Amino acid sequence: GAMNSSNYAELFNNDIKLFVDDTNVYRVTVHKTFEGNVATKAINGCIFTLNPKTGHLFLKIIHTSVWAGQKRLSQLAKWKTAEEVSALVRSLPKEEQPKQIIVTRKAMLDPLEVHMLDFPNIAIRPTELRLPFSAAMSIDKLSDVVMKATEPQMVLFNIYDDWLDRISSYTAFSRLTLLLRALKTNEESAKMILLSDPTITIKSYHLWPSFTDEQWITIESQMRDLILTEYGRKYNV
């Protein structure tokens, strides 16, 4: 049924699976109108669809035009998500199609199940994990492509850069969730940690800095420290 820490290594077996996060699909800024009422203005969004074994990210950009003249947008956003994931699966050759799709929010279960009625052999699953995929838009290059899009667009990334050349997907995923957890708890502190030594650069074809193995331990150490402090402050403990 649901995915948790008791069946965690399942993510890195050889059954093709995808995580779908819909937390950045429908994005708004809230502002005051001239008459002093409140209004939303939609900004570009994205579906975060990640193969946790390979690091392949299918970033579907959600252009604000998709909301034009629509009602109940938070509800449409889940159905638009399910529609795009489904279109994505149908676009893949059969041997590349996922055997499971894990949604980060339980409200995506019924939309995706209905859009995938054609694929009874693809299991649609929730998770009890609290994954920080919401922080995807704290990654500069992903935020950049979303905010510049003038039309609907699908951009493919490897969210692990070249890490799997040196580490397993269990470790690459653990580094990713640590990075995104930090970015989610204090974007500014996390971002300072990642770019503080301007001798370490991000390659044109990568998302993250080109850290040596020892530099990654230090960085990883600093992200944990950041997460722990913020937690003490939050809860005064």
Binding site: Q75, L76, V114, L117
Partner: protein
């Protein structure tokens, strides 16, 4: 007025005839039920004093032949049977009536309870949900499974209810996923009413029959069918005005008749709250909503 005579009552049993019920003692001189109104279906049902498990019974229409009950000491139940010899039957019944060995179907004249619960129920449609085409009457019991239950085990001894599944290619038009899931009008009107049921009467017929099998036999699969057929209408934005007004009356009488002490197991919290408070039809079931609020305010 029709009569269902009994050969004898060899085991102590609670006998139901529609909404009525009588206790008969082991070997009590009991020879059946007279003054059964013609023009309606009826159900005659049984719960043995020794096994309050396996409530069972017989849907029948007195216009379709001469029917009697005989205890089978091999299979251990009261069996419905047809007497084709008209004169033997007339003669059998007259002896038992003269000896006053028969209970009277105790209809109150003002009381339209049974008509209101069976208005759309047709014996010929029951014989297609319960397939035993060699009998004019249909056996149902507590443990019989539905065809839809058997999909997720004996196909002969099942309730062939119309399969309703809100997450099915049948119920969802490709490219109308969100629309058809949040508003089932197309599943209700085109697929179910126009395509399968042909009219609202046959839809209400199965609905009323599912409810009565739930109530009289505690048939779990029937209870699921009854709720499914309610939910399909409550979750449709577009329903003919006459269907809604009639559904409100149907459910009012079903809720009125439910034993007070059975609301916990026969009523699905989520379906009723949806219908009465959340769904498109929340303002459309005035009678049903008033009786549900005054009689089962806990559930909601």
């Amino acid at each position: 007025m029709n009569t269902v005579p009994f050969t004898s009552a060899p085991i102590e049993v609670t006998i139901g005839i529609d909404q009525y019920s009588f206790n008969v003692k082991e070997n009590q001189p009991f020879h059946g039920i007279k003054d059964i109104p013609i023009g309606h279906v009826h159900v005659i049902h049984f719960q043995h004093a020794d096994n309050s498990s396996m409530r069972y019974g017989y849907w029948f229409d007195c216009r379709m032949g001469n029917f009697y009950i005989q205890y089978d000491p091999k299979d251990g139940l009261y069996k419905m049977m047809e007497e084709r010899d008209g004169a033997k039957f007339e003669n059998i019944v007259h002896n038992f009536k003269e000896r006053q060995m028969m209970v009277s179907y105790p209809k109150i004249d003002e009381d339209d309870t049974w008509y209101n619960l069976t208005e759309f129920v047709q014996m010929d449609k029951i014989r297609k949900i319960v397939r035993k085409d060699e009998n004019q009457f249909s056996y149902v019991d507590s443990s019989m499974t539905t065809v839809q239950e058997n999909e997720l085990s004996d196909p002969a001894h099942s309730l062939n209810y119309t399969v309703i599944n809100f997450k099915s290619r049948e119920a969802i038009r490709p490219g109308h996923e969100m629309e058809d899931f949040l508003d089932k009008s197309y599943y209700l009107n085109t697929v179910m009413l126009q395509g399968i049921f042909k009219n609202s009467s046959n839809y209400f017929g199965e609905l009323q029959f599912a409810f009565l099998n739930a109530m009289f036999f505690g048939n779990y699969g029937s209870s699921l069918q009854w709720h499914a057929m309610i939910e399909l209408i409550c979750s449709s934005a577009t329903v003919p005005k006459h269907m809604l007004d009639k559904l409100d009356e149907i459910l009012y009488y079903q809720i009125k008749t439910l034993p007070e002490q059975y609301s916990d197991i026969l009523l699905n919290e989520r379906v009723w709250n949806i219908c009465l408070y959340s769904s498109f039809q929340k303002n459309s079931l005035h009678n049903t909503e008033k009786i549900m609020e005054n009689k089962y305010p806990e559930l909601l």
